[PDB]
Symmetry: D2
Subunit: 459 residues, 4 copies
Amino acid sequence: GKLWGGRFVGAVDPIMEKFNASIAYDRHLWEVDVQGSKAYSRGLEKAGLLTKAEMDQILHGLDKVAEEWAQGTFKLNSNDEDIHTANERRLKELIGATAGKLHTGRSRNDQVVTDLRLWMRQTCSTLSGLLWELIRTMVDRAEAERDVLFPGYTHLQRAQPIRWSHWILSHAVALTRDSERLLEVRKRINVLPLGSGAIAGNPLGVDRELLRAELNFGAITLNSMDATSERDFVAEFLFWRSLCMTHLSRMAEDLILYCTKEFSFVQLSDAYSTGSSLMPRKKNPDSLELIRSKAGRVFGRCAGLLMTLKGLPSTYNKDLQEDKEAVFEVSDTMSAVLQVATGVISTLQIHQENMGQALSPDMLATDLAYYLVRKGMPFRQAHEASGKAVFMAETKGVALNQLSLQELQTISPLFSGDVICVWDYRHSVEQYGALGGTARSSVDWQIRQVRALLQAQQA
Amino acid sequence: GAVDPIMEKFNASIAYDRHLWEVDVQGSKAYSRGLEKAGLLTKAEMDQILHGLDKVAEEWAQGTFKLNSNDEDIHTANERRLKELIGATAGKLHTGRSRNDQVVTDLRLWMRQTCSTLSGLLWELIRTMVDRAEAERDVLFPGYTHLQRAQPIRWSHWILSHAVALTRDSERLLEVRKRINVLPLGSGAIAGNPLGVDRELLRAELNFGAITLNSMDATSERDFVAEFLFWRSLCMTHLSRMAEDLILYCTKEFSFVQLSDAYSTGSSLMPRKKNPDSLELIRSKAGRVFGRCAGLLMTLKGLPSTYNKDLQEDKEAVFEVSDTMSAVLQVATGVISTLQIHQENMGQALSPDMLATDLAYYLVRKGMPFRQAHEASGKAVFMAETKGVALNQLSLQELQTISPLFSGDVICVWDYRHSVEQYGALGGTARSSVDWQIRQVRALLQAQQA
Amino acid sequence: GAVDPIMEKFNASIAYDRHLWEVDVQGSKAYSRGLEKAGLLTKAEMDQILHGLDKVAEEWAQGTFKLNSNDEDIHTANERRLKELIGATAGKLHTGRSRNDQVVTDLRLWMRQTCSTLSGLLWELIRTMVDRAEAERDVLFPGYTHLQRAQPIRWSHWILSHAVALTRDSERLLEVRKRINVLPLGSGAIAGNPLGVDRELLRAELNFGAITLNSMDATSERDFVAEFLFWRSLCMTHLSRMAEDLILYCTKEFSFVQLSDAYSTGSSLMPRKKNPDSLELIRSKAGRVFGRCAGLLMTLKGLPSTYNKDLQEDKEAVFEVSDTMSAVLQVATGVISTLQIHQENMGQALSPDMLATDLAYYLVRKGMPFRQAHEASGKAVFMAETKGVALNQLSLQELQTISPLFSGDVICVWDYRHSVEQYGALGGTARSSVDWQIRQVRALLQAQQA
Amino acid sequence: GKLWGGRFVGAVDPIMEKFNASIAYDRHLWEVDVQGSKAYSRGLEKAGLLTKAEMDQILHGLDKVAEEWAQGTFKLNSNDEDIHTANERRLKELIGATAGKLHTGRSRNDQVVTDLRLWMRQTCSTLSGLLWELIRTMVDRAEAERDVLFPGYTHLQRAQPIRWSHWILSHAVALTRDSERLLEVRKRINVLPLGSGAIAGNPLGVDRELLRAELNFGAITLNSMDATSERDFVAEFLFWRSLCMTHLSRMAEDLILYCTKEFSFVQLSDAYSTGSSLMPRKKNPDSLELIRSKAGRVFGRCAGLLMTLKGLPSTYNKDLQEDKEAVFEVSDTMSAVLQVATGVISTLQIHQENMGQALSPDMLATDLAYYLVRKGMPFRQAHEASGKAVFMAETKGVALNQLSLQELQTISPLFSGDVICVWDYRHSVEQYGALGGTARSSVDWQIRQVRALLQAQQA
């Protein structure tokens, strides 16, 4: 430089340095990094790169390092870049000699990825459990409240009565798909990348099958270049989370709407709401709004990882370092949101009366038509008839359920005495007996169906 | 006042959903077939419907079908032409059915076809790549990290790295296809079918893997659209890397490959400047595909139960993304099968300084710990430096100055073919590992087609 | 082999860029005009070009123009028809010009027109809203936080909240329009114009605010496309909130407004169920617009210098997003000018418990610190609770039980009209503040049109 | 609950609580929160809500609180939710009485936003400076190295010689637009939202103009509902950053490419690169790759904020809380990347020779044609002629610049003796004299033009 201005800090530049450190967050990989180093150690042994004594020397030291981590006893170094350097710097202050043999044939490229996949395999496990717990909860409450009725909506307009349980099962069913997707992602995560070296593979011929068995992975990567540069397992996870958050954001929207004075169908426990000091009736759905806001947080990370991966040349690049924080943040968010959601549906109260009061006779206008279709009349005919029925009561200035059986017969001779069954909102939902419908029997069918899916997924 | 021209045009969908004509009739025919089993139609009335419905398909096939100015969507157009074709018996078709569960059935049916075609194209591209790898596994060129020459590797190992990524894309497509294959029909407008139609019958007629569990979910969820769009996005990511790599290799600077005249554009006054048009188009679609995916998730976010007009935004995204993938896969397949590698320039890019590390492995392989071996290599590096000659030009005696272990073997290290063969552990670039890889993807691929 | 049908179709752009026909001729005419000032054409040759170029526009106007099967893009079609129209003199037009700087000039010219039209539509929508606010400033309904009834406010204050947000959108559009108005022509393929054509002349002829500073940037940057797409995205965000609000208010539950039959769909058997079709469409476009924006940024990311085929992805995004905004603004304008508020239901939603806070302000206003006043209000709340009567039904004597300050005034607190008038500080919901707001946006709006 | 399983933690739930805290990050708003409280204090005074003594009582206490923050002396409370509660909890332990009068008529809704805008106004200021510094640096080096030549590319294929300075100015020019956009965003940020209350406005009629003058804002918000719920200023900023990162990612791609053995035009200082232990020639562009990876990080936050804002109902909602961390993270990233970029272009070395060697005669084939066009020949004619010229040398098996003047005349009689000027790459770039072209004079024009823009922006 010097012929012009600029930034001449020297031969280091602290900005470039902290902006390069990852220990601030990858530090959580200490558990799996150690674990992953013990397995490589046993690998080198069989390969004949160290002795049964050197292995136990190293192996043992590693356990001492882990212990320090589990006690908060581990003294980190500003002289430390990442959790990888930290662990083998300590493993060197406890063994010195052999310690500098563990990384033989190993690169940070295939080492770090092994740590991330190992760590995720574990985190995705708990996520699977937290999710099955939310589904099981929703399903159980659905069975308990199978006889409550409230309105179903389209364009957010009251359409017709439905079972509150049906509404619950509608979100549960979507979540089981999220549950199914997580399981598929978990398989592709359970693949051992260790032994790929920096790009061309392991040069000293260590056993890949052994390493695979040690760490208990499901398989080994087919290609070293892919294994060290691909991040499909991270992108896939982020999308899974994003689509799951979509569903939760929808359940949040519904519930938030249902607890407005305007609807008053549901009410949240004080544990998940915030009231007004001078207004006892004002109960803000903080919890629900929080959940809804997290859908963007999550989707954005996914969008961000995709733009980072786009157009990168083979093989390994520093750009790949952006994966860790993304996974961490989304992992925490998903755990919190899932548990908070389980607590909400678990402790929310419903107002059966308000729910029943939102049902009105004008919703039955169409049931009147179905009554005629079972009598043999074509739909167009019945629809037109029920139309006349609607028009009648209107002029008479009364409700559709106040038309006399005689008045109805001036519409069609098919209207018999049983027509009073149409005026029952209960009778209305029972029409949908076809599998997947809102009829009580169908809801039982759904509950069994979901119970089984959960079971098949436990395997 | 009573009607706004923009509002109508805005609300119109016939423009694009007209592509659903064929799957639409299939859905209707099957519905009517299950409609009479419920007693809503007479064996005679069904025949009318079925027969007349075929008449409708026929016109679409010949391109004689006359869209009406009053036609809102494909669902309406087919039912209008069915009416004026067989009378009012046609107005019995829709009984107990809603557009909510009818539209989604068509979309799924349409997607089930297209995705089968995509799986096909994708498998062919992967197949084309593995085949090429098998044939050129002798070729050697440089491997890169931070776009900085690292070490020699097999050109087949490079092809395989990408082939394997696409193989995962193939697997994800199959999982998505399983979830697409679920019947929503008989779910009504929101609460289900009120006239007791048999859904297992509909499922059997339309060949679906299963039926939907919940009516509210079946007519409002668009997971199968989102998944599909994401699948395409991640797959494009893979093609963009491959395209980036090839564009780089086509430069005068790298000069490793040359595209055929079919996927490249030349210069009139410069017969040596060929533009990777094809490759650049492939890379530009990554964003286009992702944008739809992004746009669709933002649309689904925060919608309340159950059905809302916002869902009408699925079709165009599916159509656009499907067309894009179809073309991009074929083009990619075309460039891969006809490109031409320049072997001499690839080997010419290999240098002896890339072999410094090998000298280290050489030492550890016969004794000393890695640490010592590395430091021993640094001396061999510095030595040849001060003497102005590549490591390759360093005499056995001189190396022995660093360590006694530098036996006669050391000469083999100077051979790139030896360097690559060091990686036999499964997944490495050694020829035997490549054979293994070729057999694995080949097997893996066979499993996905069963 | 030598030609792949997919590759061509894939590379084709005439399908959509045909919309650039008119701006294309303008660009060419102006170029030729500056081409002869440089001595490359004879005053006679220019006339040929100019005259013949008009002939080309003419055909496009009448729709008599015959696209050729060999036509790649609009730029080619217009030059092919110019040739076969006035001879080889036409082949002198492109001298020193490149598609790189020609295409970008057309896009900018096209956008400069469209954005002027959008600014117009947007201003009308804002205008329509302010006018309505002025007319209905007496109306009072509830304000919400966490969708939980908070306090009474003016319905005009609600309209103004949105109007003001759109006003910022209007301002951003104007800044974007300034950057769109820059001439790229005379920038060549990459290094600039080699034949010394005068760029200030071209700029003057085409009415551009300025010329580009650097040829490499002028033919590769697409900032003006990105900015525009983001502008639309943030504007859609605003319309989606407004749409969400109105859809909510249209529900039976809130029943505050009713859309006219032009922007809503009804039910045959339920004459009281009107669907907010229009509103739902507007909200669904937020994602569509954003997707393009997202997709385009991902396309620009990581491209090396200078021009690459990836840039061909700008046009469709611009066209699609422009059409969407045009319709969405008009529709929104239509619903706002014809919707109908239900005043009784709006006031009916107001409750006395919303006035609890006012009693507190009442106390601080005449003495005691806020803390004491609040606690004093809590007692008035609890009191009326245990007695089973709203705060409104609490007698002066009883309130005095809490504090002596509860003079006769207290009765005014029970009037919602008094509650709202408490907010006179500029920007509040008091009527005088609303008048102020109406005058500010009106003034602000006038400044943007000068 | 209880009739089914679920999460019954009680009346609190620690998950919902930490997932609700913001002090972990909003703590940085302590500077501006205090500042913003001093101004509201003076507001209440004039409005007559407190005495000249109560104001000084409160006002003074606030300064003591600030001081504790600046010393690290401030003792935070797990009993603290956000930086807002923290500051007035301390302001209460130092004044007790009056302390509970500062928040009169003020809501956390208009308070928090004032803090964010106040904080950003300040952060965007330094960002403007860091950016002008990068531009000034690039511009200065462009002037110093105006006589270096290397190839210009299209489709990443060598096209024709250009000035290295022109390439530099191409990115500088784009960045000045980023600079212009930041300035526009800064205006819309400098608007005072304080005095909007929670939704309806300030109830006690405090002076909005006063507050505006105290905090030195540029204007006051027109509407309380908008002022407390809109976040355009945050979204706008995030996009600005995203589009700026697009440009930097492009400069990174170029430079990364230019420092490959294949190109070898540029080399980075050790301060911003990482070499290989056993390979001294291998210099990895870590710094550049880092910059490139950050474009996705940033864009993703923007995408995330937009999805969060979409469809939210009026007025204030908890979802709006997602704004703080987004701004913070992107703000730090932009500061680091801009400085790192200034250090890179400031200290990178070029290899004039390698750059000159990448230029080849076949690039001049077209210049040969321009030579004839100035001679009067139409372009088609000249292009065809230069085509024949190209074909000739090819058959003769020699370079285009080795054709004799006589050989050239067998092509066209117009080829004179000065044609040897075409064979000079220097002569080639000098053809582009039209403003914006790569000719030396044009580059001077550009440098003056940018110098002036920077100046007009300093105002």
